[PDB]
Amino acid sequence: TPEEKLLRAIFGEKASDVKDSSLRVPNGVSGTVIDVQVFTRDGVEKDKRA
Amino acid sequence: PPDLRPLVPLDGGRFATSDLNDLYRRVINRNNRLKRLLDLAAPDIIVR
């Protein structure tokens, strides 16, 4: 409904974002991160870490 | 049944599919074309 759209717009850019959709380490393997690699598509805004 | 030949969500236009689905697709397409050809009084060699 228009109220939902105007509400999610006035509260920033938020929706049914509850999707975890995050990568974790596979169950059983430890380690220490030593290098991060990120590559963006032309046009997408680069985050500060990139 | 569809559970035996699944279409799991592979991202993008690329899709992880079963093999039988393409055969069923082709068979249904040919069957629909044959059903629509007989009504249009199509040539005998064409329906053959």
Binding site: - | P1, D3, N31, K35, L38, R48
Partner: protein, 98 residues
């Protein structure tokens, strides 16, 4: 998983498992070798049914020129279906006890 559907085909079709099993089941049932049935099912040849007063045998196969030249001798009483329909008609009118 247990519930399934079906496909209504406008034209009959022959099952390949009884065609090229070596030996076949339809070829032995019709007393006809596999090559003639193969030529019939793929529309390079015909097969006649309900011979009767004609000079031709029923279980024989015909080609395109054979169906052309043999059409003028008998028009109404002569029946020559082509494809899986002809095979189905042969199977329907085939007795077993005799």
């Amino acid at each position: 998983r247990e519930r399934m559907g079906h496909i209504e085909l406008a034209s009959p079709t022959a099952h390949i498992w009884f065609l090229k099993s070596l030996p076949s089941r339809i070829g032995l049932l019709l007393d006809m070798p596999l090559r003639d049935i193969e030529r019939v099912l793929y529309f390079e040849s015909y097969v006649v049914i309900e011979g009767g007063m004609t000079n031709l045998e029923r279980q024989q196969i015909l080609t395109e020129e054979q169906y052309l030249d043999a059409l003028e001798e008998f028009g109404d009483e002569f029946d020559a279906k082509m494809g899986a329909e002809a095979i189905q008609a042969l199977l329907k009118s085939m007795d077993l006890e005799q």
